[PDB]
Design a protein around this ligand. Structure first.
Ligand SMILES: N#Cc1cnn2c(Nc3ccc4c(c3)CC(=O)N4)cc(Cl)nc12
Ligand SMILES: N#Cc1cnn2c(Nc3ccc4c(c3)CC(=O)N4)cc(Cl)nc12
Ligand SMILES: [Cl-]
Ligand SMILES: [Cl-]
Lengths: 4, 123, 123, 4
């Protein structure tokens, strides 16, 4: 999971 | 403020290809000369300007069988259909001309681009 | 010996979400209490262990309407359905419990994982 | 395009  | 799962789109596509291999929920047969290819209309539209046009048409959207132009090569179509479902393009010296002609007909601009670049490098 | 187009899976998913927004080729309505959500069975199966089980069933595969358990929260479902079609999860303090419960029911393991990690960090 |  990432900060887009 | 959303978070994003990096591998999600690839995982979706992998499962769509699994559905295709098992012939689950396929709703169209693409006929290319003597060959038949089962697929999902939604995937075809998502990958191809030609299928996007065909399946948004108020009459063609309901057809279970689509016949491609007789000049279309079945192997070229097969390679592009595999690309649609996997992001992988089996581009070879022996098939590049057929792949590029099929990609132009199917309106798959990124495939056309790369075929053009690979041909330019060999001349 | 294939080449691969990095953005292909994301581009496919973007077009599947465009089809959903325009209600094109949607083949199921998911009913969550008083709310209805139209979707493509192939996308639901590709994202959820629950829908994969439902739509591989020889009888349920042909249903146009699926009713979820009355304990399922419509907003939680909406957030997860958006995630399925975009890879983006709108996870907030006010919705995390509903999102995690919905993801457990839908069998969306990666969403459950992250909800668990975000909850553990706040305690 | 890349070599996967
Ligand atoms: N709704 C919808 C929807 C479904 N599919 N789709 C598009 N599919 C498409 C159209 C043109 C081209 C390609 C894909 C690859 C290419 O080279 N050209 C576009 C849009 Cl703007 N919208 C949609
Ligand atoms: N054919 C086919 C096919 C279509 N969909 N699909 C799967 N969908 C799925 C099943 C379980 C789970 C998820 C997705 C996300 C998750 O957390 N669990 C799996 C397989 Cl093995 N195959 C398929
Ligand atoms: Cl393309
Ligand atoms: Cl997930």
């Amino acid at each position: 999971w990432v900060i887009p | 403020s959303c978070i994003q799962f990096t591998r999600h789109a690839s995982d979706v596509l992998l499962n769509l290809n699994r559905l295709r291999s098992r012939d689950i929920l396929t709703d169209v047969v693409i006929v290319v000369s003597r060959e038949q290819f089962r697929a999902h209309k939604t995937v075809l539209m998502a990958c191809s300007g030609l299928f996007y046009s065909i399946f948004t048409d108020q009459l063609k959207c309901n057809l279970s069988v689509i016949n491609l132009d007789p000049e279309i090569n079945p192997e070229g179509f097969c390679i592009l259909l595999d690309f649609m479902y996997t992001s992988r393009l089996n581009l070879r010296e022996g098939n590049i001309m057929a792949v590029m002609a099929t990609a132009m007909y199917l309106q798959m601009e990124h495939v056309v681009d790369t075929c053009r670049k690979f041909i330019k490098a060999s001349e």
